[model samples]
Every structure is written in C-alpha cells, then in structure tokens.
Target: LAKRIDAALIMKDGRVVKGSNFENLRDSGDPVELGKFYSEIGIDELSFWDITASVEKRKTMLELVEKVAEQIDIPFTVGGGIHDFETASELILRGADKVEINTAAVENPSLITQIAQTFGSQAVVVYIAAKRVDGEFMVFTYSGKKNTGILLRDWVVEVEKRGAGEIVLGSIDRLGTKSGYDTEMIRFVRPLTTLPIIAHRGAGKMEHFLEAFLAGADAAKADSVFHFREIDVRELKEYLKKHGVNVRLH
Candidate 1:
C-alpha cells in the first residue's frame, strides 16, 4: 500500500505561525481551531513543533497540546524541548500520538534508543534540520540556529541505528521559501533506512509534493502552504490522487 502524506502545523508561543528561512515568523491562527479545521478536511496526520521549546529550555507546548488533542481526531506528534523520556511520556499522556526530538537527540544519541524502547519505535521521530554549508548538507540544532557541523547523511544513519521510527528531513535553505522540497536531500537520505521520511519545508504547490514522493520521500509536510490558504488539504490530496499518489480523501 502507498503511504499517505501529512500536514505540518508549526507553533510559537501557542499561536500557529509561519516563517521564512526560519526567521520573520508571523501568526497564522489558533492552533486548536486550525487543527480541528485540518482534521475535518482529512489531513492524514498532524505534526506540531514548538519551534522555540528547545532553545527556551522547557517542555513542549503542553497546554496547546491538550487543547488540540481534544479537537483533532487524527494522530498528532509534538516536538520541541522534548529532552527526556519523562517529557515525552507526558506529551503522549497529554494526547500526542508521538514525540519528536532534535537537539536532545543530537546531544544524547542514546535517548533515541531509550525512547523507542520505552514508547515503542512508532512513537519516536527525530527531526533533522539540514542546511547546505560549503557545498555539503550539514545538520543544525536549536531550531536551525546552530550548525552542528554533522553531515546530514551520517547523522541519518546514526539515528536509524538508534531506533528512530521516522525522520522529518527539513531543509533550512528551503525553509518558508515556498520553492520546493529538496528532492536531492530527500533522495540522499531515502536509501539509508527503511523508515518513512517526511519531507519538510518549501512545498509551495501540489507539484512539489508529487516531486518529493517521486524522489523517494514517504511523505511531504508543509506549513505555510496549508496554513495560509495558498493550498487546501482536500485540494492537495485530490491533486495527488489524480497524479496517482494515494492519499485519504475527505
């Protein structure tokens, strides 16, 4: 069976927001309201990242998690400031179907194994924010503010070995540019593991999603496109379906 794509809902300070290249963020709308809207429209899965959680050194948007959990029906994953199993557990208990880790996973690689072991592999998602630095794709942490100097391919291998269930491969270069998914980056990491890769960033139009999947991505995620009304979930899914990509219809 063909895997389904997903919608990404990014939040900062409890309000859904959009940013360009990881900067100049502007508010979109209420997370809970927007979440319910997507759920009604048949978004396969939803992912919420607290963008500032790690850098701020606190838990994820728990209050927001609780509210959205009440309104949305589909599986949702929450990320940011998720540094330990306890925090991950709390998010799950608060209604997050999965937990995503980035900076913390890079800080302590064992946390990935521990999370998978405790919460099951399906519950552990590792976010890799990559940027093209000096002609090589390097990983970054703390919401793309710090370059980790780690080659993205190498880090991907390490995470897969550590038992990560999925990878959200976001391009810092394409962040909020509405250009397109980094097919090269998606193709580069696709061969490393059997886990699903959720292509993040860019995705200005329906063709971008199709290109990502054709390039070996299991799914493609977009923030601005959906949140800003530039693209609708139902419309995008229909487009993909017409193009022979399988997606759940409303």
Candidate 2:
C-alpha cells in the first residue's frame, strides 16, 4: 500500500514545493522528503490533495496549508478542508493557487455558486470522487470512506449553476487500480457544464489519457505514473500530440 501512494513536487527560486496523499495529516512526514525530491527537479506544479477529510483533521487543514506554502514557491493547490467561503479565503491568502472542494459542495450545493461568485470559478475546483457501484454512479466522500448516495448528473447540474469553473472527476473504482479512468462517467457529466474537466485518479498508461478525452474530459490528473517517473510528462505530451489530443509541449 505504501508503494501505491504516488505524487510529485516542483521547486523554483530555492523554495521547495511538494504534493502527496492526504493520510489524515500524517502527510506532513512525507512533505520534507517529497520537497527534497522536488528541489532536485526544479519548477513544476505541486498539488496537495488531502485524501482524508474526516472530521478529525478539519482544524489542522489550514495549518497544514500554511506549513506547505511556507516552504514553497511557484503555486500550489490544497484540498481536504477547503469547503466553505471563509476557509477558501484563508487558504488563498495563505498562498494556495487553488482550493479543491468536494464533499462540502455535496453538502451545501450552494457553496459552488457562492464561492465562485465571490472569488471567481478559477479559484474553486469541485472534485467528484465518483464510482460505479452495481452499474450506478455514486459520489464518495471522506477519502472514499462514505458514499453520498447522490447521482452524478444531478450533482453536476447544481455545481455548474454555482459557477464551478473546473471539475476534478476522480473515478474511485479506477483510482490506483490502473484500470483506466471511468470514461463513462466523464461523458455522462460532460454536457452538464462548460468548465474544464480534469479526469483524475486512474491513469495507468498514456493511452488512458486519450480515452479520457474520448469520454469528454478536457484534461487529466495522473498520480502514480508521473510521481514515480514511470512516465515523463514531456514524453507523455509528445505521445498525446501524436495521438491528436492537442497537448502543449515545452
């Protein structure tokens, strides 16, 4: 299970930035090591997604954000505790490039509109940890611990109305399983909003990225493949270009 956890960090201007799995704030232990690795790599994007949103760590979520921001530059996105407007503002002021909200959007539904209206949709990314259970799609919350019993279509509708500019649709069943993304879910929810949709969680191969677009995902967020260096972003970009995904290679 330890090897299954995958992510990366990028640094610039002597400031180290790293992103790792949210292990109930046990993530702090890995930040230093991950930062060390990022320091080696130089500039890149650091996505700090908290896998654990259990009530136990709510208070420490912002604290962790400050700790991470203090050590890095180049921009970072923090997830897990950014559910409401107040917390989102605090996280942004603390140096977060973007604040990811999932469970809170499900609970409040209005949070998407409120936050997007107040701060702009770009600052708010709504995560949909969706999975197909017995042929039906359901949203999972609290690190995939609890099911929200909400249908994917309905939730997406409300999220769009609330001005959510981006969507991180994480297919739970395919997450870390390397079974490829749930392309079906992506297509099902595509027409619901015009914002860029980030197909997340399952991306075992470069081919998976293309499938995501076929399923209507605008972009993809891969964890294990890039984090462990199994696939280099440069190489993957070239592959996507050859396959006609219109990726920008730098």
Candidate 3:
C-alpha cells in the first residue's frame, strides 16, 4: 500500500482529496477527501486547511469550513484569510480544531489577541514563515512572498502578547530542501514564550525531528518529508522514542 502524505488535505468528494505544498507554489488538492480516504484505510487524525483562505474573504473561509465539516469528524485545522477574530470564531464554530493565521497576523496582529481572548489562546494558532539568510532570521508574510523586517524575537513576543496559544514556525529556505530544520533558530525562540511551537517547513527525516525538539520545538511539521513518502509518522515516532523524545504512539 502507498501512503500519501500532505501538509493540508482538501477533500472534494467521498474518496478524492488534495494536498498542499509548502514550497515553490502552495497549491490545494482536498482535505475532506483525504480525510475520508485515510479514514476508510484505518488511519486516525486528519488536518485540513483551505490554503487560499489566507488571502481570501471571511465568507469564503466560513463556507469552505462548513463544506469540509459536512464530510467527516476528524481534527481539522483551517487557515488563510483569517484577518480578524470574528472570522476565526466562525471557523472554529464550524468544527476546526485550530485557526492558522499567517499574513493577517502581519497585517493586523491585534486580531491574534482578539481571537485568543474570545476563543481561548489554546485554540488560536499563529503561523510564521521564517528564513535564515546570511546568519540572520527574518519573518516573511503573504505566504513567503514578502518580508516583514521583523526579527524572530520581537515578532514572536508580539504574537504571544496578542494571545497566540500555539505557533507554527517554518523555515522557507530549508523547505523542500530536505536539509533539516534550523535548530539554532528554533532554540533561540523556544524560551521566549510558553505557547507550544510547531516547527514547520524543513525536517527531511526523522533525525531532523530530534534536532527540532532539542532546539525546543514542541512539535515538527514535515510536508515534503512525510507526504512524499520519505518517512512514515509511525517510523518517525519510533525513531524519536529511541532517541528519548516523548511522543504519542497509536
């Protein structure tokens, strides 16, 4: 059996779903269909996101969330175009486990706090696309298309203050390169906030996960490494356990 891995799944029909690429060009296939596919195959846990919602409208995001929720009862993460607390609230109410914000947080960071306050910080998720160029870390927004000129420390502090309960930190250059996560970067930002951080963008192998965790990342999100069949989540878990990393194994 061939296992399909993905960053986000957009389910279009009963057995049809799409995947999202974290680098080059971010495209969608389907989360709901992926959910159904995996569910039928006995896989547990599913995360879905409408990748375009980061730049779209509130109504569109809400509609998409509603549509996806109609398909399955699995853990889903809905992101994109969530510029304000009201919209995020609607998506959560529609059955999303967490709301992911990237560009909007850069555009109006205050929305982060508002959503956290209304929905509880634990439910509010903030995503960051970071790059290490010439030994310096910079934050990028609009889905890695623009630089915010904000350093990692300051930006992370701002997001925490704004009530972000969790953070998704991804390194753009390491993305799809299979080089591994920027351990120093993750370590540097780890002690700054109490919120759990999900390291994204890099991680080409199970060994990369150890580096992330040791650097203080609460979890690691690997799109290419996992979705492309480079590694299995269970195998990765076993490796982590052997390396003394605590993880949930099902």
Candidate 4:
C-alpha cells in the first residue's frame, strides 16, 4: 500500500508544458518555479520528465534536474531519454533520487536488470504508456509515438521479473482529459507485480486520487490539476486522511 501520492511535471524545451489526451501542447509555467511551489506545499514526491527527450534522441535534462533539486528538499525523479547506465548514473550524480526509463528498456529488456544490479532495484523505474485498442491495453513508447505490440499486462509482468523497482503506468487515452484515472487498468496491474505502482495522468480532482488508491495504486500522479492550482497537495493529503487512507502529513 502507498502512504502518499505525487505531482507530475512535463518538461519540453526547458519549460513545463501540458496537453490534453497527449496532444495540443501548452505552457504550464517554468520548471524551476513549479518545483519550488510543490516543494513548499509538501508534495510527497515530484516527478519531472522531458517529454521530447526520447524521440529527439537527446540526453536527460541534467541541468533542469539539478536546478529543480536545488530548490526542493523532497526527493525528485528525472526521466525521459535515459538510455544506458551512464545516462542513469549522470542523473543520480546530478541529484535525481530516481531515473525512469521507457523506450530503451522496451528495446533492451536486460537494461532493467543492469540498472538494478548497479544501483539497486529501488533506483530503477519503468514507465508504461498504455493505449486501449479494441478493448485491450497495449504499450506505447517514444512518448506514445509508436506501438510496441506489447500488451500492458504481459509487459508489467516482464518488467517485474526483469528487476524493475517500480512502475509508472499512464493512460494515453485519458491523459489530461480530466476524466479521472483508468482505475480498471490499475486494478488489472496491481496483482501482477509486487513493485510499487505509481498511477499517472487522467487525474482532475481529489476524488480521482481516492479512486486510484481504492483500485490498489501505490500513488496517484497528476500534472494539470496541481499545475493550475486546482488542488493543493497538503490539502489533498488531509482529504485522503479524512477518508481513512494512509498518507504522510507534513
């Protein structure tokens, strides 16, 4: 079970950006500014992903990671375009508590084992961007640009067996739609792996977080809701506590 949830920030071109259903990008604000805000509000954890890093074939945003790390006392994760051990280590060296991988891990399954062996499983996270096609969830990579033909259920099981410490599952269909999370998908994935599951995207309100927790998610992650100041992290924690969910209050 999870003790708390987190806020997600998508970075593009050195700025924080958000989109609906993964399309129509718009600026949310500056990354550093947003990071400090979340830090002050006592978010359990902050997640930063360079949305274009993978497809653009660039390095992880180390500079941005360092800047955000400097502004926050909380542990923050950096992801996108982390292809190998060197890149992963660089992020950690620059102050990222964890590094998330997607395309590279899908192409090279052993990468998961390699990272775990080098830095322990807790430092490695595998991201699964899921899209529903014909009533079945399929995994998409490269920022949801391509379909890997890998079923979500099977992929989650494989990542766990390959030594992934945690999984961040995002629903491409519901992303930024304010339609709530894909709880059914969360329910389907929860029993497949012992690793922590951080449910991402599709969150629009406090109740959505509760729905995710009830569906067995270890943590619920959102971008726009928190970015737009629609929900405050400290208040959200209090709301969850009132509903009898276990969450750390700071």
Candidate 5:
C-alpha cells in the first residue's frame, strides 16, 4: 500500500508552536529550521498549518513560506488562511504540493471546485474539523474555535463531490490528547468517499498511527510528538514496518 505518514508543524505568529486541545501554546522551534529537519529526518510529507490565519484576518505569511520552501525538498502541504484559488495558487507556485482549506471550503463550497478545476483535484485538501455532537459528527472551523454545525457525513459528500482530492479528518476533541485518534469516526466516515483521508491530531504512540491506518486512514499526522522529541520518525516508521505497513524505509 502507498500509505503515508506525515509530520504536522503548527505555526503561530510565524513561529512553530504546539499545545494540547489547541490551547496553552508554546514555541517549539523555528519554522524554517524544523521544516528542513522534518524533511531530512525521513518524514513522508510535511503538513504545515498556520493555526491562526483566518481568525487573525491575515493571509498566510508568504515570506515565511518562501523561507521554508527553500529549506525543505519534501512534498509540502500548507493550511490556515487559504481561502481562495489565488491563495492556493500562490502557495503551490511557491512550492506547496497541496493547500488545506477548512473555513474557506465551508464558507464557499465553490472554491473547492475552483481550485480543483485550475490545479487538478490532487492539489486541494479539504480539512474537516469534526466534533461529535448529539450522535452526529458536527464540523468545526477557524482552528476549532467555531462549530459550523455541519454534519460530517454531509460535508464529506459535499467536498468529495466538489472535486476535493483528499479529506483531512481532524478530531477536535482528541487533538493533542494523544489518547488516540477517534478511529471509530474514521471507520464511520471511511466508506463515505473514495478520497484519501489524512487522520489529524490525537496521536501519542506508534500504535495510534497504526490504529489510524488500520481504521482506514490513508495517512496519519502529528506534531508535538515529533517536535518535542517524544517519538522520532524513523522509530515510528520502523514500528509501522514491524506491523507490516509497507511504508518507505528511509
């Protein structure tokens, strides 16, 4: 299987940061340096999230993106504040392989089509921040600060139909907890669309990533574990390899 495992880098004010449940943030490392580190250390892909672009009402830091782009030679995916085809285009033009849209995609479903039509569906990633509410997986946006009340099932169908190439399923409740991915949710949403699902947040151990893959996620992403030196990418990949995941042996 061509499954992927990625390292997530959360950016705040142009600095790499990490926190549990999306609060109590602290600087982890310089974005440019860490970006290169992840790329050199055998991370399959780099998932870089601005984490505050929408709420801050600022566009992605193009200068920072340029700097980081020059450092890493891996497939790069950037999120946070990308709201239109232009922004997505600029990122891809700069070096990002894909642009992840959560608030923008929800507020304007057509943007998904716009990006896909212009750059091929594979260049766009639709991030679904979901929180279980009243037995329904409700969607949240704006870095998990705003609950959109949109059902995950409905949005999954919406984005997949809108030409989104992949779905990034983020568990707001389990984010940073490291307890585990809401595998039940991935297992529930797995059959809904053919798009690859990138499991986000709630990863603490190698087994968590393994659980995510076994539950049907095409990829699993985490930040603190990698950034804080709690788990190295080589170790995780070896663990996955031991379990017959067939990941790249870099």
Candidate 6:
C-alpha cells in the first residue's frame, strides 16, 4: 500500500477557510488557486470539501470542481452534500477522481456500498469527524456540529465492511490546533480495519506527520499548515523519508 501526503482544502460558500476546532473560519483563499498550488507542489493528493453542505442540503458545486480540475494534475476528491449515488455520479462526471461522504454515509451506509459498486471502492472516501464525549470518541457529521452517537471504533469497522476505500478519522479537539493529529485516536482505531486511515487536522510541524505513521496511520491530512504555507509537502516528505515512512517524493 502506498502512503500518501494529502492536503485538505475546507470550503465554505465557495472560498477556502481554516479554523480551530472547526469554528471561527477565516478565509484563506480560493479553492481553484489553492488546489492548483498544491498540485504543482507535488502533493500526492488534494481534497476539496464544502463544509457548509452539511446542513445546507445542497449539492457540491460542480463548477468549482470543473475549474479546479482544469488546473490540478494530482488525484482530487470532492465532498459535501452528496446524499445518493446520483449526486456521487455527478461529482465523478465533473472531474473528481473521488467523492467524500461524511453525513450521508452515516444516514444510509448502503450509500457506501452503492457508490463502491458503481465507481469501485477506491472512489469512496468516508469522512468520519469524531469528537470525544465523556472520554469516548463519538462520530459527528455536518462539519462537527452534530454528534451522531455512533462509536468511533464501531463505525470504523462498519465503513470498512461497507467497502469504503479510505477513512478520514478527524479529531474535533485536535483539529486546527496544530498540536498534531490525535495519535491517541489513531492508535486506538488502527486495528479495527484494513482500510487506510488518513489522520486529519492539527498537523503543524514535520514531526507530527511521522508521529501519525508511527501510530499506524497510512496518511496524514492537514489544512491549517498547508493553507498557511507553514510547511511544504516536499519538505514534509523529506522529513518522513528520513524517519523511514514511505512517501512519494518529487
């Protein structure tokens, strides 16, 4: 299996934004320009997520995908407001290499199996935003505003069985803090499934990337660090390589 270095661009109402604990979102830049910059820098993959689609009940903006797709050369994933296979199909048709589903998959996990059946499992990435409640990780959706009461451990296994190609296990407490991903959560969830887990959020330094791999994550995803240009993917890969984590270097 290939270990990936991924960049996540959180979009709200068409512009890219970054925030701590998923709130206080401040504008960073446009998706298309930010995406193209990351692609050119040789990141293994780039993901664009419409965070507000959580409750807006709207579909992903295909026009943004159409625009970003023209400039990006790496694998791209688009998410938010995808509730059914029809919506998923529209995204794939627009130019997204993959479609990420957070809330809808929790609403109807069969949607995961359905998408895998049509697009193959690799095209479906389940975004599981997990937060700690009473010392246990609980699944959340709608951009971490609502907790689903689903156990993180159980949900991780379910997504794997449902044919999810990848899982983004994000820590609400650790998100945007740049303290590093909750390797504690990564350590706990690693044994539940064979699907690659992309440790999301709070990645601000080079060592944090290696820590995730050490904790059994196949990839580490960051928005704040990358958006602020605090760390370059090339530099991060060199760091991971030094520590013996296998990542494609440009």
Best by lDDT: 6
Cα lDDT tens digits for candidate 6, 144-248: 888889999989999999999999988898865888879999999998988889998778799988988899999888877766668877888888888788888
Candidate 3 residue-wise lDDT, 1-250, digit = tens: 1112224443333211324332332233444554555444333345454544224445556666676678766556777566777778889998776788888888888888788777888777888888875677889888688878888788999999988887888778776677888787788788888877777766778788888888888767654454455776667767777878876540
**TM-scores for every predicted model:** 0.89, 0.75, 0.79, 0.88, 0.89, 0.88
Name the 10 consecutive residues with the lowest summed lDDT in model 5.
Answer: 19-28
The sequence of per-residue lDDT tens digits that candidate 5 reaches over residues 114-223 is 99998899999998989988888999987788878889999999999999999999898897698999899999899999999999879988899889999999998888
Write the residue-wise lDDT of candidate 2 on 1-250 in tens digits.
Answer: 0001123333222222343433333343465445434433432445665544366444555665676677766455677556678878887776676778888888887887777776788888888888887788888887789888888777787777788877888888776688787888888888878877778877788787778877877777765566555666566666767877766430
Q: Tell how far residue 158 is off in model 3, in angstroms.
A: 1.1
lDDT string, candidate 4, 35-85, tens digits: 776777667888888866454434438778778878788878888778898
**CA lDDT of each prediction against the hidden true structure:** 0.82, 0.67, 0.68, 0.83, 0.83, 0.83
Which wins on TM-score, candidate 2 or candidate 4? 4
Model 1 spans > 4 angstroms off: 18-28, 51-60
Residue pairs with backbone atoms closer than 3 Å in model 4 (clashes): none
Report how far off residue 161 is in candidate 1 (Å). Answer: 0.9
Q: Name the top TM-score candidate.
A: 5
TM-score of 4: 0.88
- Candidate 6 regions with alpha-carbon error over 4 angstroms: 18-28, 51-60
Cα-based lDDT at residue 25, candidate 6: 32
Model 6 lDDT on a 0 to 1 scale: 0.83
